[PDB]
């Protein structure tokens, strides 16, 4: 547990003792030194602050600290087990708050899970926002000549990782704000669109057009809306773009207005029905852009009674009170 001045120290692979002394020494016998270090392929032994501290580099074989007095017989060696060795490797069960892991023996981490959440750098790996993640991390050693693989450590997560603090579990896809069913931050997996619960609204999107006020619309908020506190759109309504056989569509035949927003519409039926908007531009007959002269012929008739023919322009009998009209346009 501590380095003593009149003792010899070494690292051992076994506890056995023979006629010439301890068996299985991995290092040579080293005299006491303040800060003295013993080194082999598996461990680094350091004499620090009058205390014995260790740093494992590999755990494939069991290691001991061998102690022998300078005056004593070489067969009087004392061993202190540092760690038990397993060639197939140690199996670590990842706890709920597990984040960082280091693969021993300079092994490469091989991740087998629900979705990739791991950041990898040499033998080091990082589980980034593993919310709902299950699977294993296998520390593997390859061979340049034989091409055989050996496992030195297995990190396992049987049941899903619970919710983790400091993880954004909402992601913008295009302009729509989606929920992260699994993961967080960049490890996020898209589920469904987030729904409007409350809060201040920046704008709303309905039938492919943007609105910031209720005027002209059936109601407000409508369709999907973006909060002043977010960059994406949350789903508010499922309201139909089809109104009286008149469907508001981003690529429409005729332009008209809903409040301040210019809207495009298409006819679904040729029935007599209203437009779900207000006129885009009202052109005058005497207007500078277009000149069209108006003249009309009229006669006396009985109420709701018509004479032949039907107005050339309107294709209908123009009747008001006890009079019939026939217009002539430029």
Figure out which of the listed residues 121, 197, 295, 316 binds ligand NAG, where binding follows CB under 6 A: 197
Strand partners, 8: 31, 68
Nearer to its own copies, 186 or 306 (CB): 306
C-alpha 211/C-alpha 160 separation (Å) is 42
Comparing CA positions, the residue from 38, 43, 46 lying closest to residue 63 is 43
Contact call for residue 182 and ligand NAG (CB under 6 A)? no
Nearer to ligand NAG, 105 or 128 (CB): 128
Nearer to its own copies, 186 or 323 (CB): 323
Contact call for residue 230 and ligand NAG (CB under 6 A)? yes
Beta sheet of 124-127, edge-to-edge order: 100-102, 124-127, 118-121
The CA–CA distances, whole Å, from 299 to 77, 286, 322 equal: 134, 26, 9
Contact call for residue 222 and ligand NAG (CB under 6 A)? no
Contact call for residue 165 and ligand NAG (CB under 6 A)? no
Contact call for residue 324 and its own copies (CB under 8 A)? yes
Contact call for residue 71 and its own copies (CB under 8 A)? no
Task: DSSP for 186-251, please give it.
Answer: GG-EEEEEPBP-SS-EEEEEETTEEESS-TTSSSSS-SEEEETT-SSEEE-----SEETTEEE-SS
The CA–CA distances, whole Å, from 243 to 224, 274, 283 equal: 18, 9, 26
Contact call for residue 262 and its own copies (CB under 8 A)? no
C-alpha 107/C-alpha 124 separation (Å) is 9
Contact call for residue 225 and ligand NAG (CB under 6 A)? no
Figure out which of the listed residues 45, 82, 129, 217 binds ligand NAG, where binding follows CB under 6 A: 129
- The residue ranges that bind ligand NAG (CB under 6 A) are 116, 119, 128-129, 166-168, 185, 197-199, 227, 229-230
By CB under 8 A, name the binding residues for its own copies. Answer: 246, 253-256, 265-267, 270-275, 277-286, 292, 294-308, 313-315, 317-318, 320, 322, 324, 327
């Amino acid at each position: 547990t501590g380095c003593k001045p009149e003792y010899y120290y070494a690292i051992a692979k076994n506890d056995r003792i023979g006629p010439l002394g301890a068996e299985g020494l991995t290092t040579v016998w080293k005299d006491y030194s303040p800060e003295m270090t013993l080194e082999d392929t598996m461990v680094i032994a350091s004499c620090r602050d009058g205390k014995f501290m260790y740093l494992s580099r590999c755990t494939r074989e069991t290691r001991y600290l061998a102690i022998l007095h300078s005056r004593a017989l070489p067969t009087s060696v004392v061993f202190k087990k540092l760690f038990e060795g397993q060639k197939q490797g140690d199996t670590v069960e990842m706890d709920d708050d597990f984040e960082f892991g280091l693969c021993p023996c300079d092994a490469k981490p091989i991740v087998r899970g629900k979705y990739n959440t791991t950041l990898l750098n040499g033998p080091a790996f990082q589980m980034v926002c593993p919310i709902g993640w299950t699977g294993t991390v296998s520390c593997m050693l390859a061979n340049r000549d034989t091409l055989d693989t050996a496992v030195v450590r297995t990190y396992r997560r049987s049941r899903p990782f619970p919710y983790r603090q400091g993880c954004i579990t909402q992601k913008v896809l295009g302009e729509d704000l989606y929920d992260c069913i699994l993961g967080g931050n960049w490890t996020c997996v898209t589920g469904d669109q987030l729904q409007y619960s409350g809060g201040s609204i920046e704008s709303c999107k309905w039938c492919g057009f943007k609105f910031q006020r209720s005027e002209g619309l059936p109601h407000y908020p409508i369709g999907k809306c973006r909060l002043k506190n977010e960059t994406g759109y949350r789903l508010v309504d499922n309201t139909s773009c089809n109104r009286e056989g008149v469907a508001i569509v981003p690529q429409g035949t005729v332009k008209c207005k809903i409040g301040d927003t210019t809207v495009q519409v298409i006819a679904l039926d040729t029935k007599l029905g209203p437009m779900p908007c207000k006129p885009y531009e009202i052109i005058s007959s005497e207007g500078p852009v277009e000149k069209t002269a108006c003249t009309f012929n009229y006669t006396k008739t009985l109420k709701n009674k018509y004479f032949e023919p039907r107005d050339s322009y309107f294709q209908q009998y123009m009747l008001k009170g006890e009079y019939q009209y026939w217009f002539d346009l430029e």
